[PDB]
Design a protein around this ligand. Sequence first.
Ligand SMILES: CCc1cc2c(s1)-[n+]1c(n[nH]c1C)CN=C2c1ccccc1Cl
Length: 126
Amino acid sequence: SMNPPPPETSNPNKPKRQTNQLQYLLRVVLKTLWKHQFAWPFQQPVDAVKLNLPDYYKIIKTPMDMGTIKKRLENNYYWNAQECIQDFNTMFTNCYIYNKPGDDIVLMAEALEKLFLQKINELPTE
Ligand SMILES: CCc1cc2c(s1)-[n+]1c(n[nH]c1C)CN=C2c1ccccc1Cl
């Protein structure tokens, strides 16, 4: 088994901005999820070798994680909040796609997602 390369967090010819909605995604939306007791599986790319989950990346073709999302926010990778919000949703969705209802990991994802939804509710106007 092998892990793929992680998602890129740097791309010089990608257009970037530092919008207030994007400043908010880092300061409220990501920093809220990051500190949570259930954040740890989501803090780095899934290591399918360490976990002995050789199927992971045969199933999940758009991996995403908060380690990547954090690096993207810090390295001003994004153009808009919707690109960043899409990364969060991809992260949650991947978890639900790969894992069975009632798995501990799904309960963890579901806790974080509740907060995530609660924070994006008060995303400022651009
Ligand atoms: C940090 C190490 C990880 C463990 C797990 C990770 S990532 N995971 C998986 N699917 N999506 C994500 C993210 C596979 N299940 C787990 C996992 C999490 C909690 C308890 C047990 C497991 Cl087995």
